[PDB]
Amino acid sequence: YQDVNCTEVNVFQTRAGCLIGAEHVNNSYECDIPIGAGICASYQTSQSIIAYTMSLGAENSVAYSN
Amino acid sequence: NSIAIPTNFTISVTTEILPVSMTKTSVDCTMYICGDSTECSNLLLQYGSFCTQLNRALTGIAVEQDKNTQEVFAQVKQIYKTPPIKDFGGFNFSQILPDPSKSKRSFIEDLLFNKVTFNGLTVLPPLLTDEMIAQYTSALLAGTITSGWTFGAGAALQIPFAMQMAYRFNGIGVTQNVLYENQKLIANQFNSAIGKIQDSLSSTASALGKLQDVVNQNAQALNTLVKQLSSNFGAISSVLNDILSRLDPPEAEVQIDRLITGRLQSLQTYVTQQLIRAAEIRASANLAATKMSECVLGQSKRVDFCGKGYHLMSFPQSAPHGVVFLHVTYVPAQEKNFTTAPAICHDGKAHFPREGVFVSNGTHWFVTQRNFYEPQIITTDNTFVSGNCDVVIGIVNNTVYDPLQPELDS
Amino acid sequence: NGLTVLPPLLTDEMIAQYTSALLAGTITSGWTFGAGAALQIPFAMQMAYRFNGIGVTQNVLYENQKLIANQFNSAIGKIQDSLSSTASALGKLQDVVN
Amino acid sequence: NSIAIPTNFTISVTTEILPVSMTKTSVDCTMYICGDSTECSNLLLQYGS
Amino acid sequence: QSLQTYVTQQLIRAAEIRASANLAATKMSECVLGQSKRVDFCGKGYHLM
Amino acid sequence: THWFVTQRNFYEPQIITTDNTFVSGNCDVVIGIVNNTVYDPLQPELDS
Ligand SMILES: *[C@@H]1O[C@H](CO)[C@@H](O[C@@H]2O[C@H](CO)[C@@H](O[C@@H]3O[C@H](CO)[C@@H](O)[C@H](O)[C@@H]3O)[C@H](O)[C@H]2NC(C)=O)[C@H](O)[C@H]1NC(C)=O
Ligand SMILES: *[C@@H]1O[C@H](CO)[C@@H](O[C@@H]2O[C@H](CO)[C@@H](O[C@@H]3O[C@H](CO)[C@@H](O)[C@H](O)[C@@H]3O)[C@H](O)[C@H]2NC(C)=O)[C@H](O)[C@H]1NC(C)=O
Ligand SMILES: *[C@@H]1O[C@H](CO)[C@@H](O[C@@H]2O[C@H](CO)[C@@H](O[C@@H]3O[C@H](CO)[C@@H](O)[C@H](O)[C@@H]3O)[C@H](O)[C@H]2NC(C)=O)[C@H](O)[C@H]1NC(C)=O
Ligand SMILES: *[C@@H]1O[C@H](CO)[C@@H](O[C@@H]2O[C@H](CO)[C@@H](O)[C@H](O)[C@H]2NC(C)=O)[C@H](O)[C@H]1NC(C)=O
Ligand SMILES: *[C@@H]1O[C@H](CO)[C@@H](O[C@@H]2O[C@H](CO)[C@@H](O)[C@H](O)[C@H]2NC(C)=O)[C@H](O)[C@H]1NC(C)=O
Ligand SMILES: *[C@@H]1O[C@H](CO)[C@@H](O[C@@H]2O[C@H](CO)[C@@H](O)[C@H](O)[C@H]2NC(C)=O)[C@H](O)[C@H]1NC(C)=O
Ligand SMILES: *[C@@H]1O[C@H](CO)[C@@H](O[C@@H]2O[C@H](CO)[C@@H](O)[C@H](O)[C@H]2NC(C)=O)[C@H](O)[C@H]1NC(C)=O
Ligand SMILES: *[C@@H]1O[C@H](CO)[C@@H](O)[C@H](O)[C@H]1NC(C)=O
Ligand SMILES: *[C@@H]1O[C@H](CO)[C@@H](O)[C@H](O)[C@H]1NC(C)=O
């Protein structure tokens, strides 16, 4: 629900508004289904829709030395 | 016979600012035209698909602002980061690499974000937060700084920055010993040129104007859209509730059909102007995505595409609704006159330079690279032969130095 | 009937002063005037660097510079004839006016 | 086993034409819709912006 | 609607001219001020000037 | 302990030689310079 204030009727408040029916995960993945403000959703393991901040890629310390 | 050749150079840094995305504004034509007013809704639905094709059209614009933001910044395969020791050959990126002490924007990106400024309306959030644009631009920075063009074309192969700039100098036709003999000067020229930007974005407002215009056009398009709710359009009141109090349905439904005709033409105006504006901004997002692939992820041979002067490299800095490129350019300096010739006659053969240009200090003669006077004695190791003194106009008589004959004479 | 036509900022004479400067930059100083200062270079040598940039070695200009002057001069005359005989080339401007 | 290599060249001077600017035509909204009529102008202001 | 039709045609025709002015600005920067190595961008044959 | 020269975009280790190298100035100005021989493809021929 876009911009609504999340006591306005599994249940959660993204920056984009209230997301119902998906679990918020302390993890990140590629942005499978977009939602906005860095939040995305995907279908994962027992299966559910999960919601998370997207990941921009593998972090890589290029092994620079002079 | 007259040529001028630079004795010296200035590395200069220039700022190019490009729009990338509008605000993702969307407007319910139901609540804009009618809104908590079923007597109007029952009238509006008779005009058929118009409100559905407006919601669909502004939704197309909204999704495209995230495609534009994606195609400019999300070019990099991985989130590269720098080692702890900043041993970049004495070049100093302090203003432009991210501050761990803050979003983790860089110093120059903060100065960029510091210099840019309700019924039926909605504003959707962009898909990449400003912090995610700052992580993508840090990946683009640290990729470019540690691995040259290679992260744009495969793996991020590391190289020392003193040698990365030697490839960039070699690429503009300036022989790489010109870098190595001058690397302390060149680091000081680069560093103080980013310093001039760190001043300019703090003291002066004019640079961000090209992003501020994207903001000002949208705020004026929405104020104009909302002020059109107050207009009469020939109905007895512009307030929808006044008609739905003061008049019975047989008159009120004709009065409302004037308002619906008006409030529908204000939306068709705004949505057409936002479709046109989105095409204008998408052409700048495609220009930005191009400049990032060609000038950051590469080195551009394209004249005045990445600033005046020959392009060494460039750095992206995020900005609200846009991108900023710090283009780095060799600009030639301190030219001197010399007599020149296309070729020389030595024992009657015409000798031509392999890559350089022939020049004279009034008396003797030298080859040099064209972009920086570095005279070298005219040997067989820096010339090639074709034909004889007849066929070339203005061929000079001068000695060529054979480099074998001193060795063989021993 | 409420219709009006504003003048362009640059007059067509001032546009001819810009094209004149771009000609003089390109003829006297090669590509250099795009990168900063106009470093002069003789035009026969400028064309040897234009040739060298496309993988034809400098001697192939210098051994043939009389032929290349005549080919170029011929081709410039052909453009005056081609513009003079038919307006159809300017059809991309004329469509915008129409 | 075979390549063709050009034994000569032709310099060509191909011409290309590009449009750059429109005529800067501006039309006044009121003098177009209403001409000099004060009564039409007072009705035109009911359509707002 | 007669005026707003013409303005909407001109906003689209202006963008078709901006797309062409940007191409003419690009061809001047690369092909007058420089020597492009971009095939067919500046005439058939290999570009000299 | 010993050094090679290669093209940049594919590993092909040649010997460091007077055909594939050029000179400018004495050591001290190049920050990070190293010590190695440069083979000469023609200077051994004094004996023959
Ligand atoms: C043009 O460039 C040449 C570079 O070869 C200049 O000639 C060279 O100049 C140096 C000194 O600058 C000469 O060596 C020194 O000459 C003085 C003369 O008093 C002597 O005391 C020293 O023991 C030493 O020999 C060098 O011989 C000379 N080379 C040649 C081939 O002539 C030249 O001066 C420059 N400018 C002009 C106007 O010619
Ligand atoms: C560059 O050096 C060449 C070779 O020394 C110079 O060209 C040659 O100049 C000589 C006289 O200095 C010419 O020989 C004379 O020819 C006349 C007839 O023209 C004859 O009566 C004399 O007995 C004598 O043989 C020679 O023909 C000429 N060769 C050519 C190919 O022109 C040249 O002048 C020098 N140029 C410069 C810019 O220093
Ligand atoms: C390379 O191609 C060019 C054309 O792109 C050739 O240029 C000109 O070609 C004509 C023949 O098609 C030459 O005509 C001959 O000229 C002499 C007098 O110079 C005349 O007596 C003959 O009856 C005949 O018409 C013309 O000379 C030539 N232009 C120049 C300035 O050379 C060129 O011939 C080609 N290169 C070679 C090696 O043939
Ligand atoms: C890189 O540039 C920064 C400035 O952007 C330099 O940092 C300054 O260094 C002096 C001397 O250590 C300090 O007194 C200043 O407080 C520093 N900050 C500023 C904003 O001036 C830094 O020294 C440069 N060199 C390196 C290798 O980092
Ligand atoms: C080339 O230009 C640089 C500056 O861009 C010159 O370096 C300056 O040299 C003077 C003394 O001649 C010093 O006072 C300055 O401190 C130097 N500036 C910098 C930024 O280091 C250099 O001398 C010039 N000359 C040549 C032949 O390269
Ligand atoms: C450069 O141009 C000059 C003309 O400006 C050419 O002609 C010679 O010019 C010198 C004086 O600069 C005179 O002493 C000669 O007598 C002129 N030649 C003739 C045939 O009279 C000159 O040949 C040109 N040089 C080059 C290198 O192209
Ligand atoms: C390369 O090796 C030479 C010796 O073969 C080094 O030169 C000596 O360096 C010491 C440094 O304290 C001086 O005391 C000597 O006088 C130098 N001898 C000569 C002949 O110059 C040189 O420093 C080495 N270079 C590098 C970059 O390692
Ligand atoms: C509603 O939104 C505001 C911020 O816009 C926030 O302060 C408030 O806590 C929200 N309401 C609830 C129930 O959290
Ligand atoms: C490379 O790193 C080492 C670290 O001790 C340093 O001594 C050396 O001067 C550096 N070389 C260059 C060319 O930066």
Contact B270, D49 (CB under 8 A): no
> From the alpha carbon of B341, which atom of ligand 6 is closest?
27
Q: How was this structure determined?
A: cryo-EM
Which one of F24, F42, F46 has the shortest CB-CB distance to B181? F24
Rounded CA separation B291/B301 (Å) = 12
Chain B CA closest to residue C67: B391
Contact D22, E14 (CB under 8 A): yes
F29–B167: do the CB atoms touch at under 8 Å? no
Amino acid at B175: T
First vs last Cα of chain A: how many Å apart?
52
D46–B230: do the CB atoms touch at under 8 Å? no
Contact F1, F16 (CB under 8 A): no
The CA–CA distances, whole Å, from B283 to B33, B225, B288, E19, F30 equal 32, 25, 9, 9, 45
Contact B40, B260 (CB under 8 A): yes
Rounded CA separation B301/B313 (Å) = 11
Q: SS in 3 state form for B334-349?
A: EEEEEEEECCEEECCE
Chain B CA closest to residue D48: B231
D18–E17: do the CB atoms touch at under 8 Å? no
Burial-class residue B378 by CB neighbours within 10 Å (0-12, 13-18, 19+): buried
Cα-based angle B55, B57, B62 (whole degrees, multiple of 5):
90
Alpha helices, H only, B99-180: 107-113, 130-147, 161-171, 177-180
Q: CA of B225 to nearest chain D CA: how many angstroms apart?
A: 9
Chain B CA closest to residue C66: B393
Using the mean position of ligand 3's atoms as its centre, give its distance from the Cα of residue B165 in Å: 49
Ligand showing the shortest atom-to-Cα distance for residue F34: 7
C4: enclosing H helix or E strand:
strand C3-6
Q: Phi and psi at residue B9, in whole multiples of 5°?
A: -150, 160
Most B CBs within 10 A among E5, E13, E30, hence the mutation to make, goes to E30
Contacts of E38 (CB under 8 A, 6+ apart): B302, E30
E37–C53: do the CB atoms touch at under 8 Å? yes
Burial-class residue B103 by CB neighbours within 10 Å (0-12, 13-18, 19+): middle
For residue B397, the cross-strand partners are B345
Contacts of B118 (CB under 8 A, 6+ apart): none
**Two tokens at C4?**
């009006």
Rounded CA separation B358/B376 (Å) = 10
Give me the count of residues in chain E: 49
Amino acid at B144: T
For residue B106, the cross-strand partners are B98
Contacts of F21 (CB under 8 A, 6+ apart): F5, F38
Rounded CA separation B369/F18 (Å) = 20
Contact B228, B268 (CB under 8 A): no
Contacts of B273 (CB under 8 A, 6+ apart): B221, E11
Alpha helices, H only, B292-359: none
3-state secondary structure of B316: strand
**Two tokens at C90?**
């300017």
Rounded CA separation B133/B74 (Å) = 9
**Helix axes of B249-291 and E2-27: crossing angle, nearest 10 degrees:** 0
Ligand showing the shortest atom-to-Cα distance for residue A18: 8
D49–B262: do the CB atoms touch at under 8 Å? no
Contact A1, A17 (CB under 8 A): yes
Q: Do chains A and C touch (3 or more CB pairs under 8 A)?
A: no
Resolution (A): 3.4
CB-based burial, B387-397: b 16+ in 10 Å, e otherwise: beeebbeebbe
Ligand showing the shortest atom-to-Cα distance for residue D9: 3
Contact D42, D34 (CB under 8 A): no
Bridge pairing between strands A11-14 and B396-397: unpaired
Count other C-beta atoms under 10 Å from residue A62's C-beta: 21
**Two tokens at C40?**
């002069």
Helix, strand, coil shares of chain B, percent, nearest 5, are: 45, 20, 35
Among residues B334, B346, B327, the alpha carbon closest in space to that of B389 is found at B346
Rounded CA separation B233/B258 (Å) = 6
First vs last Cα of chain E: how many Å apart?
49
Bridge pairing between strands B310-319 and B344-346: unpaired
DSSP 8-class letter at B35: S
E21–D20: do the CB atoms touch at under 8 Å? yes
Question: Tokens 């490839």 identify what position?
Answer: B167
Give me the count of residues in chain D: 49
A38–B132: do the CB atoms touch at under 8 Å? yes
Rounded CA separation B286/B275 (Å) = 16
Among residues B73, B60, B59, the alpha carbon closest in space to that of B285 is found at B73
**Two tokens at B160?**
């020392």
Q: CA of D1 to nearest chain C CA: how many angstroms apart?
A: 23
Q: CA of B63 to nearest chain F CA: how many angstroms apart?
A: 39
Contact B259, B233 (CB under 8 A): yes
Amino acid at A9: V
Chain C CA closest to residue E49: C50
Count other C-beta atoms under 10 Å from residue A59's C-beta: 12
DSSP per-residue string spanning B187-230: HHHHHHHHHHHHHHHHH--GGGHHHHHHHHHHHHHHHHHHHTTS
Among residues B382, B312, B391, the alpha carbon closest in space to that of B345 is found at B391
Pocket test for ligand 1, best of B358, B364, B365 (most atoms within 8 A of CB): B364
**Helix axes of B130-147 and B50-73: crossing angle, nearest 10 degrees:** 30
E chain contacts of residue B305, beta-carbon cutoff 8 Å: 26, 29-30
Contact D46, B234 (CB under 8 A): yes
Among residues D35, A30, D48, the alpha carbon closest in space to that of B270 is found at D48
B351: enclosing H helix or E strand:
strand B349-353
C chain contacts of residue B353, beta-carbon cutoff 8 Å: 58
Pocket test for ligand 8, best of A5, A6, A8, A13 (most atoms within 8 A of CB): A5
Question: Which amino acids bring their CB within 6 angstroms of ligand 1?
Answer: B 361-364
Rounded CA separation B330/B165 (Å) = 11
